[PDB]
Assembly symmetry: D2
Homo-oligomer: 138 residues x 4
């Protein structure tokens, strides 16, 4: 089983603010880009269910910032499976600065998504998505 | 004769250079036009959850002087014209204290279509939306 | 005892699911904390162009209910505590017709620092910013 | 080739309640593309920006032909339209390349001015930036 799923992003000017570093919200956006790239590549049919009856909703998210990223930096975001609780999936995120080559931890994050049906009713994690997560056991 | 959208420029609007990143000016067009829809055309809005689709045909903006963090910008929207199913809106951006100072100028066009299974077929501007826009006609 | 930031939810705030994308909740914290600086701490703001830097050390948000397009959200900020150089802010998100409805709840921590020689350097919260946050502290 | 390419996977944050990509994102991609270009083709020019050189966006625009959707892959193709002493005009073509075949979905354009950083003074486009731009001339 693979330990992680890697997402890479080149930091551009819009990611930064007047202070000179990457604005904190962008770290959360990278969690979104990462988790949804995983869905596109590892569980395509699950996405089709979302336009129907399936509803994947973020229940919580968080991020801790150790060091700063700058413009034209390359960030490597590694997502790992923390655990599954019936309908809830918890992910872990590790942010690395890999601009000069060697990776250096600049931030650590975590978020939880819930699988529901269109009010909203908790439903067990779809088998396709469930099989995809099996290769990323902690 | 204009519909105003006021916005306090915060750090996220800025970049490492110090000024407001140019894409935010287009974002303010969206916030303005949709705040307009919420206040002036509720029936048109409620209809969008059904068979009505508003698609942006084109957009543009011209920049004269820069906005900075914690500045207050007055986005002022006016009706440029209506061509059957297409609505063209004009935007003027004002740095507002003292007298208001023009810092930018923009424009975008929105088309009204019927969301059908075959595709998006152009429908004339809804009566509610047209009369509401005429209040800001030249 | 809270500082309010009101926001009209527009189409850009939503995604294909129909609700507000979760990152926007964090954006509203930034918009709220910086509106606070502009209105309650001008001396601290101008000092940031000098040798003062406010770095975000952590943030989080819990989501109870969904916000939709053209909803009005009341982002209410209060002081949780201060530890030397770090400020922890609490956030409550309310859906505002009728009575206000809590839809989310978050928190973030900001550290004050010097732009000195070896980069960032921990600094006790400026007196201007310290007394400004007191008005929104549980007291 | 005849264009500098910026490839982007459309994720959920790019979309709105309708299901298509919100129009402002097309402009965001112009910024990401131009700044990725600068990082790879004009590193010394980038270095000048932290000193006295300032590239100011004077205008931008985009024309939308057909919609992009979630998990689409878009190919943003930037070419040189013209250089007027200190002003650079870039052209952008947006292609859906999801399933493989490329289809034009949008076309944009923006102009940047090379100035010096009181007051702004026009300065001729740096030779490094100029010769790098010539590779994508019409
Ligand atoms: Cl569009």
């Amino acid at each position: 089983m693979r330990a992680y799923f890697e997402y890479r992003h080149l930091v551009t000017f819009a990611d930064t603010n007047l202070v000179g570093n990457v604005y904190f919200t962008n770290y959360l956006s990278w969690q979104g880009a990462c988790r949804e790239r995983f869905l596109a590549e590892k569980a395509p049919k699950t996405v089709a269910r979302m336009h129907d009856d399936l509803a994947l909703v973020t229940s919580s998210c968080s991020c801790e910032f150790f060091s700063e990223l700058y413009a034209l930096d390359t960030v490597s975001v590694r997502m790992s499976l923390v655990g599954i609780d019936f309908h809830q999936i918890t992910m872990g995120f590790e942010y690395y600065r890999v601009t000069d080559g060697p990776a250096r931890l600049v931030a650590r994050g975590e978020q939880t998504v819930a699988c529901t049906l269109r009010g909203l009713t908790p439903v067990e994690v779809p088998d396709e998505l469930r099989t995809a997560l099996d290769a990323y056991a902690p």
